[PDB]
Specification:
By secondary structure, the chain is α+β, with helices and mostly antiparallel strands. It contains eight helices and five strands, in the order ββααβαααααββα. The protein has one domain: Glutaredoxin (3-Layer(aba) Sandwich), CATH 3.40.30. It is 52% helix and 11% strand. The chain has a five-stranded mixed sheet, with helices on both faces.
Length: 188
């Protein structure tokens, strides 16, 4: 076939009931995730091809960057609660991997302040039980799917994208293939 299990995607041996339709995992410490966000715009190009009615979820993971990794997972929770994902994603990536100016929770906080979230609003979110459950959600979802690597994308809790099996001579062609694969899995 044109799309084959084990080539553009793999199938989970242990399917995950009730899982989000399109579920992406990343880490701000993850170099391909940096590429995926800033150079390739994967999430965005996937949205653009997804059918009507499909929601898109993105979660941060703990298993990279130790203590700071965990802080970043809580900050991503804050970003989700406040709806400011689109304002912090780029400065966080660059703060961790480009300029290396993020070394502590306070430096993470500064990115939000500079993006214009109020301190009081950030610290209140940071400490909120709504954010605690949001952190739990991120961890549970990664837990439900064996997760030891990022970037990662899962569709309908049963299929996992396999970008290793796509041509990367051309970045644009890679993205479209990736997105079309997600659309194909979505319709399955």
């Amino acid at each position: 076939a044109q799309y084959e299990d084990g080539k553009q995607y793999t199938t989970l041996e242990k399917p995950v009931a009730g899982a989000p339709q399109v579920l992406e995992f990343f880490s701000f410490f993850c170099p391909h995730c940096y590429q995926f966000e800033e150079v390739l715009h994967i999430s965005d190009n996937v949205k653009k091809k997804l059918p009507e009615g499909v929601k898109m979820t993105k979660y941060h993971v703990n298993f990279m960057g130790g203590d700071l990794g965990k802080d970043l997972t809580q900050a991503w929770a804050v970003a989700m609660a406040l709806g400011v994902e689109d304002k912090v994603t780029v400065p966080l990536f660059e703060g961790v991997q480009k300029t290396q100016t993020i070394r502590s929770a306070s430096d993470i906080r500064d990115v939000f302040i500079n993006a214009g979230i109020k301190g009081e609003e950030y610290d209140a979110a940071w400490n909120s039980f709504v954010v605690k459950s949001l952190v739990a959600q991120q961890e549970k979802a990664a837990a439900d799917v064996q997760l030891r690597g990022v970037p990662a994308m899962f569709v309908n809790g049963k299929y996992q994208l396999n970008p290793q099996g796509m041509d990367t001579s051309n970045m644009d062609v890679f993205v479209q293939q990736y997105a079309d694969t997600v659309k194909y899995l979505s319709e399955k």
